[PDB]
């Protein structure tokens, strides 16, 4: 995969109807071109997909880890 920093995002499009329980963990990356993207490693060996950091289950996830 040829890459550069001029136009770099881990995903241009992030996934929203993806299951919370179907992930093994969250991997979050902040690229210069795109705000914030979370990438989850899906169960078994399917692949790893980008989850919207603004998704519902992510919202509660971040918040709870932060303090509450």
């Amino acid at each position: 995969k040829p890459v550069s920093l001029s136009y770099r995002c881990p995903c241009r499009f992030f996934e929203s109807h993806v299951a919370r329980a179907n992930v093994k963990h969250l991997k979050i990356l902040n690229t210069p071109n795109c705000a914030c993207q979370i990438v989850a490693r899906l169960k078994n060996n399917n692949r790893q997909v980008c989850i919207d950091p603004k998704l519902k289950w992510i919202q509660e996830y971040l918040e709870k880890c932060l303090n509450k």
Binding site: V3, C9, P10, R12, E15, T31, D52
Partner: protein, 38 residues
Amino acid sequence: MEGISIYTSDNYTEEMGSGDYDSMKEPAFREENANFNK
């Protein structure tokens, strides 16, 4: 969102990954889509 000095993407390179699962955007924290297939 802001052009703030973030970290450097060392191991994780990327530039434009794709999306599935109805790849959508904007906080979906409160939405009431109660399984409606019609």
